[PDB]
């Protein structure tokens, strides 16, 4: 299962034996982001705006803690866009799924998020964020052509293109009327 | 008069070429942006394995 969340994300659970369980979108006290971890400190300090205390020395007894098997997991490239356009917690793969089945799963859905006359700049900015890891040269270009339609002047070019997009059916109609005149006017020159 | 008649002709040609280029620039942008989106969808995605040691920053 995948689900979209708000940035910044911070979760710190104090454990009973005196360690702390941390999952956080940003670094603090040398703890890596995005991967969770069990954290212990030798001297009281403030991390993620709260106090992580040094635990009381304990006596060792025979353990019964479980040790689960490790597991690599491959996710779809655009998992973030799939989770965002559902607005609920959604199933994205299985532990033991093939590359082919995994891909043919949100492909039709994703293809039909096509370019529109009404949010071309907002679309072009998604395409860049999607392309950045694949082709960084193209991303930087797309991002540029994004900010040109949005920012340059008062966004007048964005406006102009948006409007010329919505007019398409009228233009064809006129274009057709011109041909029907031109053909007649031409045929009415030949002897 | 001849200069004004010539100017009108030359203006119309540059005005025609101006549009026929804009038609070609927009058409090429729509084709390339839509293909790249298709390729973005089918790329291999990230891998996660819960290894902390791997993500250490010094």
């Amino acid at each position: 299962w995948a689900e979209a969340v708000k940035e910044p994300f911070v979760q710190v659970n104090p454990l009973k034996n005196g360690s702390y369980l941390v999952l956080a979108s940003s670094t603090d006290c040398q703890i890596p982001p995005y991967v969770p971890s069990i954290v212990t400190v030798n001297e009281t300090t403030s991390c993620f705006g709260l106090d992580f205390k040094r635990p009381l020395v304990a006596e060792e007894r025979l353990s019964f803690e479980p040790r689960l098997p490790n597991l690599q997991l491959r996710l779809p490239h655009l998992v973030g866009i799939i989770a965002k356009i559902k607005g609920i917690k959604i199933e994205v793969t299985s532990s033991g799924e093939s590359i082919k089945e995994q891909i043919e799963r949100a492909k039709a859905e994703l293809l039909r998020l096509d370019i529109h006359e009404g949010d071309t700049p907002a679309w072009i900015q998604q395409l860049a964020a999607a392309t950045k890891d694949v082709w960084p040269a193209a991303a930087s270009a797309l991002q540029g052509i994004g900010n040109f339609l949005s920012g340059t002047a008062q966004g007048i070019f964005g406006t102009a293109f948006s409007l010329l997009g919505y007019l398409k059916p009228i233009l064809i109609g006129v274009g057709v009327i011109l041909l029907v005149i031109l053909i007649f006017k031409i045929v009415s020159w030949i002897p | 008069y001849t200069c004004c008649a010539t100017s009108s002709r030359v203006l119309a040609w540059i005005f025609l070429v101006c549009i026929l280029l804009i038609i070609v620039l927009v058409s090429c942008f729509v084709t390339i942006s839509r293909i790249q989106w298709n390729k973005d969808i089918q790329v291999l995605g990230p891998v996660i394995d819960w290894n902390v040691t791997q993500r250490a920053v010094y």
Binding site: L21, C29, Q30, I31, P32, V35, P36, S37, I38, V39, T40, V41, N42, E43, T45, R67, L68, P69, N70, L71 | W50, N51, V52, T53
Partner: peptide, 23 residues
């Protein structure tokens, strides 16, 4: 007269371990 505050080094040890499968 000139009062100043010089920084002086120090450190706190921080151990970290993994949680297979996030369980």
């Amino acid at each position: 007269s000139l009062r100043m505050q010089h920084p002086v080094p120090k450190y706190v040890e921080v151990n970290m371990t993994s949680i297979p499968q996030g369980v």
